[PDB]
Design a protein around this ligand. Structure first.
Ligand SMILES: NC(=O)c1ccc[n+]([C@@H]2O[C@H](COP(=O)([O-])OP(=O)(O)OC[C@H]3O[C@@H](n4cnc5c(N)ncnc54)[C@H](O)[C@@H]3O)[C@@H](O)[C@H]2O)c1
Ligand SMILES: NC(=O)c1ccc[n+]([C@@H]2O[C@H](COP(=O)([O-])OP(=O)(O)OC[C@H]3O[C@@H](n4cnc5c(N)ncnc54)[C@H](O)[C@@H]3O)[C@@H](O)[C@H]2O)c1
Ligand SMILES: O=c1ccn([C@@H]2O[C@H](COP(=O)(O)OP(=O)(O)O[C@H]3O[C@H](CO)[C@@H](O)[C@H](O)[C@H]3O)[C@@H](O)[C@H]2O)c(=O)[nH]1
Ligand SMILES: O=c1ccn([C@@H]2O[C@H](COP(=O)(O)OP(=O)(O)O[C@H]3O[C@H](CO)[C@@H](O)[C@H](O)[C@H]3O)[C@@H](O)[C@H]2O)c(=O)[nH]1
Ligand code: NA
Ligand code: NA
Lengths: 338, 338
């Protein structure tokens, strides 16, 4: 199929693009490069074994969006573009609402104009809000995210829902991601954060590579097996795969298809640390710190639905998540070249 | 004060502007005229006894917004602009999200750019969602509105909240309106809907004036005193007044000040009908129809807070609401001139 992948040069999108090309789809990436570099493009092509067309631009640019859509005869759009730094969203709410909420509305408005009606949205587990019931099931009603970032995702999901209802021939997937980690097995593509990484894995990776002193473990008094926070880590390659599948199986299938993308199991901060130490051949340095603001103690996905309906499930392990990360981190300590 | 009133030429805004001028404030109205006419301007000036500067434009136009804000040295902004037809929002979700959500974000982004930090937002009771607890109190947590229109208001309230938190010197009032009705006592300004009116009052008014046959009463089996739906009707003049007060007393007072704007009492469809029959000197024709989709049986505001904190409360009665409406309807059956 002809697919436009916004945010295509970012973390999850690049991996997604590789898998997409591998499946012989025609890929058009649209990214504004606020959190990615042009240097990843050649890697995508290489690893994907096919050329993806790149367009520098902003989802907020309705007209451009509309033009692309038409120019490339797109059949479906995978929307990864946006801002996602939680803490920062607290400090800069407008930018999040603008990039994410207005960003998506401009994009879907362009889609409407161009007659495109198949969409895949990058959502988040946070939409479940403070749910005591874990694992989290798609049949649960959403709650209220604590950060503007989370709010923004929930808002988009709602907008998309209403849109579908009003334009019923639309096929829209709301992919609720849990905690993406890992890197392409080649060790030549992976997550490349700028500055202090906010997620656990990359932070650990930075400590291991000698860039950081110690990992601060946000709280050790949770009502968890080891007192550290528990999450549902999912390898970026599995995520990528789930995207291809969702795109291929839901294209032209009217409705709002919601699926939790996770391994369906939880792992502690300690569990992750240990896996990493093992992967990089040395004990990762860490210390206990106070709980982070708004942090939940533990949650993970119920991924039966995706299994059942899309025949999709994770195949990579936690060790692999760690190994792949270390490989990329270690082979390219400066990440993507400027 | 110097105040920018978006949506100033509309229903609630025009009345608000009159009251504002009467209090000697400098008013700049910004409206795109999608649901109002230039013909109301001269009426505002007349009734307000002072000239308000008018600017035709769209809140979505950040740059313009920013320019106005600066050009006019605005001190505070009253934001009434947006789309509000519930049913239509179900049918055209994008336009609502765009006008309301993106619309407000562009406006507050312009405010930020111009250094303006006092805002008043037109909110809705629907934000309380399906709350069994009535009357509705500001201390209640919000729920989930059933229409994109309602969702859009809730989204804005959230965005504004986050913004305030990140820019703490901002003063933002979230005015939750209940059911505005009525008209300026002069009978020369009032609500001028185009096409089939969606609210009860105007519809009744149209029946009375001979334009409509019968009023359809949406359901007569509610668990209410008379089986008809109950609401908190509030005279547009009271609403207007509450806006002036809120603006004058909250300007430069950091925080998110939320207030329910209602009379604090409920009235049935029948109650309203009867009041109107009385006002126009003839029985209003009506019939019982099935319940409307998503209609709640009864709700009204708890307005103690505004009383307590702003010393504000309604002064107009239901009869006056009816009388004023009929007066405007009857004196200007074609509404505002093209
Ligand atoms: N990474 C996670 O843990 C996590 C968890 C759940 C949800 N998500 C979501 O998944 C998506 C992808 O996340 P990611 O990890 O790849 O982050 P990322 O930063 O790597 O990917 C986002 C990309 O989109 C681009 N972009 C940002 N705003 C844009 C705009 N207005 N116009 C055009 N391009 C724009 C950035 O340049 C970047 O390449 C995001 O929408 C994110 O919110 C990620
Ligand atoms: N009327 C009600 O019962 C009710 C109940 C609760 C909330 N509200 C809200 O109160 C506000 C005022 O409502 P109203 O009854 O006066 O409606 P209205 O239609 O009379 O007022 C809205 C005005 O804003 C203008 N406008 C619309 N979109 C615009 C845009 N993008 N840029 C610039 N101007 C734009 C329209 O031309 C119109 O003059 C709205 O935000 C509405 O959602 C009204
Ligand atoms: O330096 C660090 C970083 C993380 N943690 C802990 O590690 C776990 C995971 O932290 P993080 O990677 O920040 O995961 P989450 O907090 O759960 O958030 C991610 O996963 C969510 C869905 O699960 C999405 O909403 C977000 O976009 C995404 O960043 C949590 O227990 C954190 O307490 C630490 O102890 N120290
Ligand atoms: O032709 C009609 C119109 C209305 N009604 C009834 O009259 C009452 C009020 O109807 P309406 O004016 O549509 O009031 P609401 O449905 O309560 O909605 C208004 O008030 C809300 C807050 O109270 C805001 O969210 C909306 O913007 C606003 O339009 C309800 O019981 C309706 O069932 C009828 O029976 N027939
Ligand atoms: Na429809
Ligand atoms: Na701050």
């Amino acid at each position: 199929m002809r697919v436009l992948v916004t945010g295509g040069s970012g973390y999850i999108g690049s991996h997604t693009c590789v898998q997409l090309l591998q499946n012989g789809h025609d890929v058009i990436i649209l990214d504004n490069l606020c959190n990615s570099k042009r240097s990843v493009l050649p890697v995508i092509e290489r690893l994907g074994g096919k050329h993806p067309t790149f367009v520098e631009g902003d989802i907020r640019n309705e007209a451009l969006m509309t033009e692309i859509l038409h120019d490339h005869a797109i059949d479906t759009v995978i929307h990864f573009a946006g801002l996602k730094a939680v803490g920062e969203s607290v400090q800069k709410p407008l930018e999040y609402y603008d990039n994410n909420v207005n960003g998506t509305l401009r994009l879907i408005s362009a889609m409407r104009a161009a007659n495109v009606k198949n969409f895949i949205f990058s959502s988040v587990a946070t939409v479940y809000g403070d749910n005591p019931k874990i694992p989290y099931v798609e049949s649960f009603p959403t709650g209220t995210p604590q950060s503007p970032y989370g709010k923004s995702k929930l808002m988009v999901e709602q907008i998309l829902t209403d849109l579908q209802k009003a334009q019923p021939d639309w096929s829209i997937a709301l992919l609720r991601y849990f905690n993406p980690v890992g890197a392409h097995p080649s060790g030549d593509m992976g997550e490349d954060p700028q500055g202090i990484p906010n997620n656990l894995m990359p932070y650990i990776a930075q400590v291991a590579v000698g860039r950081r002193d110690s990992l601060a473990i946000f709280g050790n008094d949770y009502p968890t097996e080891d007192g550290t926070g528990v999450r549902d880590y999912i390898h970026v390659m599995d995520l990528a795969d789930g995207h291809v599948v969702a795109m291929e199986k839901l294209a032209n299938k009217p409705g709002v298809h919601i699926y939790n993308l996770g391994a369906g199991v939880g792992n502690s901060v300690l569990d992750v640390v240990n896996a990493f130490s093992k992967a990089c051949g040395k004990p990762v340095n860490y210390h206990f710190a106070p709980r982070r603001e708004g942090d939940l103690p533990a949650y993970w996905a119920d991924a039966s639905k995706a299994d059942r309906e899309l025949n999709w499930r994770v195949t990579r392990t936690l060790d692999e998540m760690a190994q792949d990360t270390w490989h990329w981190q270690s082979r390219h300590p400066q990440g993507y070249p400027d």
